[PDB]
Ligand binder design. Structure first.
Ligand code: CL
Length: 298
């Protein structure tokens, strides 16, 4: 064609030949357990639909040519329970990290972020940083029988002995959604809360630069799309009245892509049952901006 897009970068015949490996996590039981609306299990299929259609690989507005990057779709994690699904996701992500490639995980519920974090902690012993981009802090306690959910993943990570809380950042969190007890929990573990209002004051990219300074080496960039305002991103499990704009999200993902300390990324809560067209496009354009950033990464 006279207009190659992301689809054209899937030139890797073998997974090991790819710079970036996409892994799908089509599960939303974690959401329903956390009192949310089902539908995020369709996130990966919606994302793939527009992945085949969008994103100029040579972008003359930003002056980035991503045509040399190689992408690979590893398919979906397949399991008969949510817990086996988490184990398989953890193991797959680890293999990608272990050979120095970049895993990008498309959800699915935010519960995926726990196994992703464990893969990081094993790949980079005692030397991991984590940013959680979410309107919520996601440090809720499990259900009565020990059942984890879309609101517990960073409580699980902060309880890891090898993980330093000083290298944990809650980014674009919202006071109206987040309990004093849960903020306290993060603060008492030495984590950092960069509230939406603080992010706005500084500018999203500037604020994310500061966050990457605190997370340091071997950073997991964990992007929950319900951190975006629902005017731009309605199709998520918990739609936000206020939040990050699409452009802020794009600029943040570009920064993540270009920052050589960011070693993996996930994207949670995309919910096509809530809204099926505009929202998956935003999600794909977020990934696209990461890809452009990655093309420039020193
Ligand atoms: Cl807003």
């Amino acid at each position: 064609t006279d207009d190659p897009r992301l689809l054209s970068l899937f030139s890797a015949q073998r997974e090991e030949d790819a710079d970036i490996v996409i892994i799908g996590f089509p599960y939303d039981e974690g959401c329903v357990r956390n009192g949310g609306r089902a539908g995020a299990k369709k996130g990966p299929a919606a994302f793939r639909f527009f992945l085949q259609r969008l994103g100029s690989v040579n972008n003359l507005e930003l002056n980035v040519d991503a045509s040399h990057l190689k992408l690979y779709d590893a398919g979906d994690i397949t399991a008969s329970t949510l817990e086996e699904a988490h184990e398989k996701l953890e193991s797959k992500v680890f293999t990608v990290l272990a050979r120095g490639a970049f895993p990008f995980v498309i959800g699915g519920g935010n519960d995926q972020s726990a196994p992703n974090g464990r893969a990081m902690l094993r790949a980079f012993p005692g030397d991991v940083g984590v940013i959680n981009v979410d309107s919520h802090l996601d440090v809720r306690p499990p259900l009565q029988d020990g059942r984890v959910h879309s609101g517990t993943p960073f409580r699980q990570l902060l309880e890891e002995s090898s993980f330093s809380g000083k290298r944990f950042v809650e980014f674009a969190c919202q006071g109206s959604q987040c309990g004093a007890l849960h903020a306290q929990y993060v603060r008492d573990h030495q984590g950092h809360l960069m509230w939406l209002s603080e992010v706005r004051k500084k500018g999203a990219v500037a604020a994310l630069e500061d966050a990457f300074g605190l997370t340091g080496k071997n950073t997991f960039f964990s992007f929950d799309v319900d951190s975006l305002k629902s005017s731009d991103m309605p199709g998520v499990s918990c739609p936000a009245a206020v939040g990050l704009s699409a452009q802020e999200a794009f600029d943040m993902c570009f920064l993540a892509g270009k920052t050589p300390t960011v070693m993996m990324m996930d994207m949670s809560e995309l919910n096509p049952l809530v809204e099926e067209y505009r929202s998956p496009r935003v999600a794909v354009y977020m990934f696209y901006h990461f890809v452009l950033g990655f093309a420039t990464r020193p």
